[PDB]
């Protein structure tokens, strides 16, 4: 039952090989939250890739 989803508020184009690309309104799943400005998660056929946390809204459970 444990969910960790976020909703993109802004588009983001991956700048490094291990980064996620997504568009606004995307639901990014299984998110690990770290406090250095970078989180990782699953979207668009990508698994556990990195994205900047200031691009998203946490979907509280």
């Amino acid at each position: 039952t444990f969910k960790s989803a976020v909703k993109a508020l802004f588009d983001y184009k991956a700048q490094r090989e291990d980064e996620l690309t997504f568009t606004k309104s995307a639901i990014i799943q299984n998110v690990e939250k770290q406090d250095g400005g970078w989180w990782r998660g699953d979207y668009g056929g990508k698994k556990q890739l990195w994205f900047p946390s200031n691009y998203v809204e946490e979907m509280i459970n």
Side-chain angles (χ1 to χ4, degrees):
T1 52
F2 178 83
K3 308 189 289 296
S4 187
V6 304
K7 182 187 80 181
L9 294 176
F10 303 93
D11 297 338
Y12 184 70
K13 179 67 167 208
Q15 300 294 294
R16 299 169 61 83
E17 197 68 10
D18 60 359
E19 289 179 11
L20 207 55
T21 287
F22 53 82
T23 45
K24 183 178 189 160
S25 310
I27 306 303
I28 301 159
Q29 284 282 10
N30 305 312
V31 175
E32 185 187 345
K33 302 172 180 175
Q34 294 178 10
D35 271 288
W38 290 90
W39 292 358
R40 67 190 316 178
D42 302 348
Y43 170 78
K46 307 298 186 182
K47 185 61 60 180
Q48 293 294 289
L49 302 191
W50 296 96
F51 60 95
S53 54
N54 56 325
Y55 282 68
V56 308
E57 190 152 82
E58 297 170 89
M59 300 183 82
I60 293 314
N61 294 329

